[PDB]
Scaffold this active site. Structure first.
Site, PDB file in Angstrom:
ATOM      1  N   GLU A 169      23.886  35.681  30.096  1.00 50.27           N
ATOM      2  CA  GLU A 169      23.300  36.084  31.360  1.00 50.27           C
ATOM      3  C   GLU A 169      22.093  36.962  31.045  1.00 50.27           C
ATOM      4  O   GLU A 169      22.242  38.052  30.497  1.00 50.27           O
ATOM      5  CB  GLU A 169      24.327  36.840  32.202  1.00 50.27           C
ATOM      6  CG  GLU A 169      23.946  37.003  33.664  1.00 50.27           C
ATOM      7  CD  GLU A 169      25.068  37.606  34.490  1.00 50.27           C
ATOM      8  OE1 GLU A 169      26.126  37.939  33.911  1.00 50.27           O
ATOM      9  OE2 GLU A 169      24.890  37.745  35.720  1.00 50.27           O
ATOM     10  N   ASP A 195      30.357  38.843  30.210  1.00 49.52           N
ATOM     11  CA  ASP A 195      31.292  39.949  30.353  1.00 49.52           C
ATOM     12  C   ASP A 195      32.644  39.450  30.849  1.00 49.52           C
ATOM     13  O   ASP A 195      32.741  38.375  31.445  1.00 49.52           O
ATOM     14  CB  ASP A 195      30.728  41.003  31.303  1.00 49.52           C
ATOM     15  CG  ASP A 195      29.421  41.589  30.806  1.00 49.52           C
ATOM     16  OD1 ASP A 195      29.380  42.029  29.638  1.00 49.52           O
ATOM     17  OD2 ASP A 195      28.439  41.606  31.579  1.00 49.52           O
ATOM     18  N   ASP A 208      34.689  41.217  32.952  1.00 56.92           N
ATOM     19  CA  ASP A 208      34.870  41.633  34.341  1.00 56.92           C
ATOM     20  C   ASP A 208      34.705  40.459  35.296  1.00 56.92           C
ATOM     21  O   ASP A 208      34.014  39.489  34.989  1.00 56.92           O
ATOM     22  CB  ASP A 208      33.883  42.745  34.711  1.00 56.92           C
ATOM     23  CG  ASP A 208      32.440  42.263  34.758  1.00 56.92           C
ATOM     24  OD1 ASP A 208      32.134  41.210  34.160  1.00 56.92           O
ATOM     25  OD2 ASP A 208      31.607  42.946  35.393  1.00 56.92           O
ATOM     26  N   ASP A 217      33.126  40.282  38.179  1.00 58.58           N
ATOM     27  CA  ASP A 217      31.776  40.176  38.725  1.00 58.58           C
ATOM     28  C   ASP A 217      30.802  39.488  37.770  1.00 58.58           C
ATOM     29  O   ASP A 217      30.029  38.618  38.175  1.00 58.58           O
ATOM     30  CB  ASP A 217      31.251  41.563  39.101  1.00 58.58           C
ATOM     31  CG  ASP A 217      32.094  42.235  40.168  1.00 58.58           C
ATOM     32  OD1 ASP A 217      32.924  41.541  40.790  1.00 58.58           O
ATOM     33  OD2 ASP A 217      31.925  43.454  40.384  1.00 58.58           O
TER      34      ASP A 217
HETATM   35 MG   LIG Z   1      31.432  46.637  43.416  1.00 60.47          MG
END
Ligand SMILES: [Mg+2]
Ligand SMILES: [Mg+2]
Ligand SMILES: [Mg+2]
Ligand SMILES: [Mg+2]
Lengths: 485, 354, 485, 354
Positions: free
Chosen positions: D23, D71, D73, D75
């Protein structure tokens, strides 16, 4: 579990509130940041930018315009039934006008917010790490207000309406007298929702259904009156979560296409006296026939799909009215207990420190000599450590549970440095008598705290006293009307 | 359409109604929550000029007196400029007829006890500080006038400040600290210059003073240039570099040094060195007149607070009412065709090319 | 003046740098925020979000993504010849790849930045208010580095190229020996610009013209070599302020339209060893004929329009090389002086405090009695005030200029509270002898400071010593080449 | 076109070359400054899937081993999900042939003195803490085995922790504090239940202990239910509400309570109460085995530091090399067609409707 079950468990962690304080991570961070700042209700106003930065810096570094919006909504009278943020400046309108720049607007904690975070310093709630791991944030607020009911919530799912604090405090007290009370016994105090923007609730079945099954659909209607002088409709208050400006555009568009009839003049006369929407009925047309035709095609009437979902134990639950009330009262018990235990410990540790200070004065001269003797503080310290040194006052409760049995009166390494640290001003013969008071007053306190921890009904009396203090200080009149017909 | 974007008023007759123009983000909301429904209409704008907006404003108008509420700062005031330049260009006559005005939000808010005050300008803020300072103040000297107060004192204070202002206006040419000391030192005369012994001892007294008073790391020295007419010269070593300042025949002849002497003449005539100043319950002996004026100001400010406004959004709708749009309170300013002209020019200036 | 002259005077206030420290308001705020935070080179790394918030909160509340970009650029090796920010993490590439989120990246002040703000605490620079008026910011940094020359600037106007610190420190020292030295005497140390991204400067006339008139146009060319094994062009370094990725796209587009000829393979082999652009010459084509054809149509060659404009006295000026050097040296004189004066004052005030503490010990017992006597500290204090109390050590310099003539040894109200404040640990007979050292060592210091303020050539020797310390500690080799041909 | 968006490598042969997918905002730059030009190619992506990008990736491929750096995570990892779901759907075979992999950045970075270590998992982070704690450690008891160390100690420590893990896995059903004390208290037998006098004194000893140890504001009590078979019951008042826990015939029969007893049996057999623990230069007497284990961990951690990574962008290009893309160091993970299937499902799940 699967990576999907986790990813769903985190998306739900942000979306749902905590039944105990009705706050999401964002709100709890923003509020805690204000408290650390010393941004109290009784201190000068601070620029929004000051808080927004502190939040972004330490607790929630995910966009300045996001954090600000959060503070904005917590300031607006039309979005929160009981504002947690005191704000001075332009904070946007019911029309959807934005709030002023964060460098211009000013904010501090509302009196009610200090209650939300009452007893936060005394280890009454669990703490979690921040993004970087340099700061600690409360897992929940030790709240005295049932915010999830009072101010409600929204899910982007859950939809909980605000409620009158006075009613809810009652219902809570009712649950305290009889743990088995029914949903209809509660509804004797909590008739229904009480929106910040007052309006008319027509159906009473929807609310009864929602307090019982956690889910239901209720009706909200604008308070409109017909007026003579031709004929004009005047709206004093509109449904909660309704944009007044877009409402206006809608009516203008309807008359354009002629889906609604009987309107010659539509103007917004809202001003500093309050809300005022004007619709002048045309001749050859009835006002209340135009009104009902509006209700039918207009946002003037809105059904509020209650869907009370909130994270109880870090897990999503659909809860009825009672379940939400009970959770607040279990949370109070825990906060109250944990508070006491901490208060007791602190009292012990302070009484223990005092005993050394008091003994120091009586034996002060020999100590002073010693201090003059040893060049290094640690050498004079060791000297104080070697030899042990108000009898009625001394007569074990005051001593902390951790304190060993061994420690004439025995001294601690720490106490030795405390006598060494004491300044020359405390030496005066007036400070001795003053300290004697604090000590004795703490004994009476530890004795009281012990009385509390032992007696289970006593703890339930202090809780009831705190709820009453909340209903009086922050209680106010209802605003929305419930008219079951 | 129009409804939903504009917040109209009850008044239907132009020349009896006023339209406010704001920047949505700055006052869009606060204006609406604080207006007066009877005759105040509000049109929030956002922009850098939205075309839909420009058709809304046109379709709007009606209204005879149209006010432009916008921040004073360069960044925020752009919306005002775009309006004035759009007016002048597209609608010349509307500005000429005096229909367009410009709201003047206060720059300050002073409050002593229950009293609060809204001050428009930095000039008015100066008039207010003087006023407070002087109120109840009287200066007791040993000179022919035992007590100096009222209109007489104002005359003195005004002259004193006028001189200090001029001093700061000629600061780059001569050291500020030196010119301040010429006020206290005896005047040098065109006739005095012709004599060398008097001139030398004079510039010696001057420099000797500056050095004893100097708190910073500076060194003053004097020199007299002989002109076949004697002219003093003040050399100052600061910081590590020394510059010298000539007191030309022009300087001593100049009106600037005369205003300094006249001030000193009055001050020396009033035996300022030894005196008492009371304002007004209490008093304290002062070694200088400026020491008395500093004390006046220290009194005047003792219990008051001063808030400066940088933007409209800094104040609540109620506060915005009391300051900017309440007919009695408000302090408006009409724009001239010459002002719209300058706003057209400015817009074009920012537009290096288009 | 006219509202237009002011509006133009503020737009120019943001756009231009300050000749004294080459910093704009944004940079100076961001850097000062880091210093207040204690975000030093010798302390642990702090998340960017932590600094960005502090800045937004107190000094420059105008967008988080704006403030971050500022910190980013001050971290990148390709944009600054001498980085003021030490950064760990992804901070974007010469290609134009963005930097990582501010919550992930870590930063602290570079060793060189501590020199930029060396002697900032000692009242060596003027302070201005922040947006709200609750905080104070330096009007300029008390810098030991001629940043405007070293790192340069850009106007959105002014265009100043970076310069080698070693060269510039020399040129500064040269201006110190002879104030009248010529632009050609300076160019003996400062041949030309020294970009972070090393490259080849072909024309030497442009730079001579720019150091003389403040304005000029110089040539910058990529360092490309032809290689065998068919034929390939390899670029080791490119012109300053040149996006390598878009450069690549350009060459690919040129070959598409066939404006340039003789390229079969264009690949970017840039890696952890350094920059490497590959262009494989086609058969039947010359490499250096393709290269020169590229220079002619490509960003490989860039003319750098030097335009040295910078705010001297809050006013814009077009200045030649010497004017910039002189301004730095006048600024140093002022900082050095103001520093001394402050250091002297502080020394005085500390020596004055000490005298009271020392006298207190000798007369300690009578004091102790008094302290025991009066219940209220102010009553014991007044007692200390009523009666006045190491003679060789005492023998006026140490006493501050503000101190009255009146104050046996006389005591100050403040000193009375200082004796009352002193703790019991200081009483030891080893602290007495220790304080005696500090005192005596401060006398030697005040005497030295006075020697400095008096002697004007002495001050110019300390400045020269500081410049040398900077050239050794932070000096490095040149990177761009100047080839006048 | 392609050049300018992709950073290719010297290697021309597929199956000898690897393409990284990142990314842009997370590692786009750091990847390029830290790769190996020889065989590592880098394609930064931004997205939520850009169509131009999707034609760049297609026009890209060539490369046999394609790594996805993103990542962990929720998101940030979306870009990974969009790829896997796009692969499975548009290009099924490429995942099946084992061409797609997933970089596994370390979750930790431990450093003692000059030594540093990169730990992949929280499971590996546990294996590392145990390892340190045990290294150089020996437990001296008075039991048949004077010294307990090496493989033997690891057996004990593992069993002890296994029990504490199970305890926390059955925490909601029974108080954590109580189950911990059953370990120390003598075992209750099916045969023991038939007798009431023994059962009563037992549950009395249990509760009597919990109360003396309780630091929080809790109250323990005991009760024995008579079943026509005697069954103990532990009632605890906390905070103000008291709950009671039945020790059913099932409980005493259950494997869960057996693993608790066996542990206690070994612990009680090793005379844990009185002992010495050394690790390894020094030692300190311990009153319990857990008190000895707490001490081990206090030693192991004394001089070390632990850094947890949450995102790729947290580390420099060099560091990113040593951890994620250096062939020897890196720890990659190939994706199965069953994993791409789950990534397709997840994408669709987020897409309630389209
Ligand atoms: Mg947030
Ligand atoms: Mg009303
Ligand atoms: Mg700006
Ligand atoms: Mg290279």
């Amino acid at each position: 579990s699967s990576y999907l079950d986790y990813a769903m468990s985190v998306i739900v962690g942000r979306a749902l509130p905590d039944v105990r304080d009705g706050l999401k991570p964002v709100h709890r961070r923003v509020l805690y940041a204000m408290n650390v700042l010393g941004n109290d209700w009784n201190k000068a106003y601070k620029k929004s930018a000051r808080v927004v930065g502190d939040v972004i810096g330490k607790y929630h570094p995910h966009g300045d315009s996001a954090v600000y919006d959060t503070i904005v909504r917590m300031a607006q009278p039309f979005s929160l039934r009981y504002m947690l943020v005191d704000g001075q400046g332009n904070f946007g309108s019911i029309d959807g006008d934005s709030a002023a720049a964060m460098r211009y607007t000013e904010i501090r904690l509302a009196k009610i917010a200090h209650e939300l975070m009452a007893d936060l310093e005394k280890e009454t709630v669990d703490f979690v790490d921040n993004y970087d791991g340099t700061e600690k944030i409360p897992d929940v607020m030790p709240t005295k207000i049932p915010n999830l009911l009072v101010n409600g919530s929204s899910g982007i799912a859950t939809n909980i309406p605000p409620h009158n604090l006075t009613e809810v405090i009652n219902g809570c007290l009712a649950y305290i007298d009889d743990e088995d009370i029914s949903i209809e016994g509660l509804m004797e105090h909590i008739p229904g929702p009480d929106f910040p923007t007052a309006a008319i609730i027509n159906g009473r079945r929807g609310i009864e259904e929602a307090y019982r099954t956690g889910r239901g659909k209720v009706y909200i209607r604008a308070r409109a009156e017909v007026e003579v002088d031709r004929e004009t409709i005047i709206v004093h208050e509109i449904p909660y979560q309704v944009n007044k400006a877009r409402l206006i555009e809608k009516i203008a568009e309807l008359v354009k296409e002629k889906r609604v009839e009987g309107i010659s003049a539509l103007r917004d006369e809202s001003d500093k006296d309050g809300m005022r929407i004007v619709i002048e009925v045309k001749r050859d047309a009835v006002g209340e026939v135009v009104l009902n035709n509006l209700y039918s095609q207009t946002q003037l009437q809105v059904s509020f799909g209650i869907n009370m979902v909130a994270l109880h134990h870090g897990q999503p639950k659909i809860m009825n009215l009672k379940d939400i009330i009970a959770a607040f009262v279990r949370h109070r018990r825990e906060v109250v207990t944990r508070r006491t235990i901490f208060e007791l410990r602190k009292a012990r540790d302070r009484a223990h420190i005092l005993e050394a200070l008091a003994v120091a004065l009586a034996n002060i001269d020999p100590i002073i000599e010693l201090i003059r003797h040893a060049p290094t503080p640690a050498e004079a310290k060791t000297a104080l450590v070697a030899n042990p040194w108000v009898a009625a006052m001394l007569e074990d409760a005051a001593r902390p549970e951790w304190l060993e049995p061994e420690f004439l009166y025995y001294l601690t390494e720490q106490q030795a440095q405390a006598i060494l640290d004491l300044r020359l001003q405390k030496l005066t013969g007036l400070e001795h008598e003053k300290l004697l008071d604090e000590y004795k007053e703490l004994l009476d306190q530890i004795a009281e705290l012990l009385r509390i921890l032992g007696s289970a009904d006593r703890l339930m009396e202090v809780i009831r006293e705190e709820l009453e203090l909340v209903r009086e200080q922050f209680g106010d009149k209802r605003r929305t009307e419930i008219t079951a017909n | 359409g129009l409804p939903g974007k504009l917040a109209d008023c009850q008044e239907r007759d132009p020349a009896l109604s006023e339209l406010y123009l704001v920047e949505g983000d700055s006052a869009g909301g606060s204006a609406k929550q604080g207006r007066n429904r009877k005759n105040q209409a509000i049109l929030p704008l956002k922009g850098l000029s939205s075309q839909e907006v420009a058709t809304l404003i046109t379709a709007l108008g009606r209204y005879h007196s149209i006010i432009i509420m916008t921040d004073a700062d360069v960044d925020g005031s752009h919306i005002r400029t775009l309006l004035l330049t759009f007016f002048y260009r597209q609608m010349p006559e509307i500005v000429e007829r005096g229909h367009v005005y410009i709201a003047q939000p206060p720059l300050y808010k002073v409050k002593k006890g229950k009293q609060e005050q809204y001050i428009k300008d930095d000039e008015a803020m100066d008039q207010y500080q003087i006023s407070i300072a002087l109120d109840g103040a009287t200066l007791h000297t040993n000179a022919s006038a035992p007590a100096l107060a009222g209109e007489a004192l104002e005359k003195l204070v005004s002259e004193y400040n006028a001189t200090q202002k001029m001093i700061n206006r000629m600061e780059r040419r001569y050291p500020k600290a030196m010119l301040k000391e010429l006020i206290y030192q005896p005047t040098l005369t065109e006739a005095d210059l012709s004599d060398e012994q008097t001139v030398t001892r004079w510039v010696n007294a001057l420099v000797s003073e500056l050095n004893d008073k100097e708190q910073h790391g500076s060194q003053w020295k004097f020199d007299v240039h002989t002109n076949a007419l004697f002219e003093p010269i003040v050399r100052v070593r600061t910081h590590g570099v020394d510059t010298d300042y000539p007191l030309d025949h022009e300087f001593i002849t100049g009106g600037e040094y005369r205003r300094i002497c006249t001030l000193g003449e009055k001050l020396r005539g009033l035996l300022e060195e030894d005196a008492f100043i009371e304002r007004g319950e209490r008093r304290q002996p002062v070694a200088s007149f400026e020491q008395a004026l500093d004390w006046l100001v220290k009194e005047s400010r003792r219990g008051l607070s001063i808030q400066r406004y940088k933007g409209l959004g800094e104040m609540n709708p109620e506060q915005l009412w009391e300051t900017t749009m309440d007919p009695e309170s408000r302090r408006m300013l009409r724009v001239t065709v010459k002002d719209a002209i300058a706003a057209d020019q400015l817009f074009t200036t920012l537009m290096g090319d288009a």
